[PDB]
């Protein structure tokens, strides 16, 4: 629902999702063959499943086609400094794709907003929803559409008949955090196949032995996983399949 939904949020108030007490695989997110740009700093895109972190912070918002190059640490513009600042030690993983067939319509889609004016900079990883009229001079105006006070929030120009650099691109960033808490979301192993009556090697969560798997005639109680013998040797492991 964070990727495929009916609508998204703006950049001044974006959706914040936390992945806790769950597990996922980043292999399906790479072979989709549907993303336009894919940048993943801090770790390799193909070697981030073996090593895992504590928590995963994912934010979702919309951006134009010419602003996709602005999501990077080490530059100054108008959106990367007033809506979402990127720190120096930014090990995020940004994913972007083109889905102009859902967030665009005839007549002008101005559903989402953005911030253009701001007094000063902001600390990274901080949301700004202040709708106060930014003053450029030294005299107030009581919040009117006159002189020396302009509204910082402005509309968009999204249109499905545009080119390629001005289309609404669904951009998401997957950041990782290494805290004192143990790693919750990591990389799990799957079930490939089962072979028996041959000298093979298996790893049933408690040992890695090389041998054959013969059909036994004794049934174990439904609370054990392994089994020893007289000579104190684990030669009976229940298949969790």
């Amino acid at each position, epitope marked *: 629902e964070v990727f495929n939904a009916t609508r998204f949020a703006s950049v001044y108030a974006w959706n914040r999702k936390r992945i806790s007490n769950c597990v996922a695989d980043y292999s399906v997110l790479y072979n989709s063959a549907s993303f336009s740009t894919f940048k993943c700093y801090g770790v390799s895109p193909t070697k981030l499943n073996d090593l895992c972190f504590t928590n995963v912070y994912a934010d979702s918002f919309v951006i134009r086609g010419d602003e996709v190059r602005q999501i990077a640490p080490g530059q100054t513009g108008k959106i990367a400094d007033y809506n979402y600042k990127l720190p120096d030690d930014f090990t995020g993983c940004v994913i972007a794709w083109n889905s102009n067939n859902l967030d665009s319509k005839v007549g002008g889609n101005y*559903n989402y907003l953005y911030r253009l004016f701001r007094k000063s900079n902001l600390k990274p990883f901080e949301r700004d*929803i*202040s*709708t106060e*009229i930014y003053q450029a001079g030294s005299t107030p105006c009581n919040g009117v559409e006159g002189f020396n006070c302009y509204f910082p929030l402005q*509309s968009y120009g999204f249109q499905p008949t545009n080119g390629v650099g001005y289309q609404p691109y669904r951009v998401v960033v997957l950041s990782f955090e290494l805290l004192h808490a143990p790693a919750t979301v990591c990389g799990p192993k799957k079930s490939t196949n089962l072979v028996k009556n041959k000298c093979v090697n298996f790893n049933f969560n408690g040992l890695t032995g090389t041998g054959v798997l013969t059909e036994s005639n004794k049934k174990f109680l439904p609370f054990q996983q392994f089994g020893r013998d007289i000579a104190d040797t684990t030669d009976a492991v229940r298949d969790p399949q």
Partner: antibody
Amino acid sequence: VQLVESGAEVKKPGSSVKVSCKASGGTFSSYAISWVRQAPGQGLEWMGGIIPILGIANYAQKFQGRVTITADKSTSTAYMELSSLRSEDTAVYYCARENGYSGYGAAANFDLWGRGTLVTVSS
Amino acid sequence: SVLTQPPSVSGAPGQRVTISCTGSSSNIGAGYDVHWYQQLPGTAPKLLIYGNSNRPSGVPDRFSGSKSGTSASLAITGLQAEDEADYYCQSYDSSLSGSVFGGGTKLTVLG
């Protein structure tokens, strides 16, 4: 400032309701205005919030496309239109005001509220 | 819906009464600030405390709000003759794309 609303109003089950939200003074054409309802029996819901400066609609995903909220800059008022009423619409609506700020959370707060409009529809 | 609250709590006129509400890890535990409101039966609700760190104008100091991880807290000291209302917890939810309130608890029991 103070926001005054209309009194009680009864309509038909399947017609359109026409209420308004008046503002006394200023500070209405600079901040966002939302509508919060309350029904005896359950919690409080939030339909959506409308900005008067840009005139952009922003509703929630739980409410379908059946309610339209407009804004006016000549007299600084807001109207609410809702057709195809049901037996659940028996509640009261409030004309609230939002004042954003800065911080790590940046959540929408309701500092200023309205009076209330009792909208009861039945047989 | 996503925010659950106890149906009713009990207290004594002079002791500390603490109320809280539990949600998910995407609306209150993600990092968003919480807002507590008071729904009096006969008037419109007003603002009591926002962000659990500031104090608005017109609200006493006896109200104390804090956020312990993924849950908020509200503690009061002394029960006066104006606490016959309901307490709701409001937080911005990302799955609902908007703000959602809580269940609501009743303080007054019987007199």
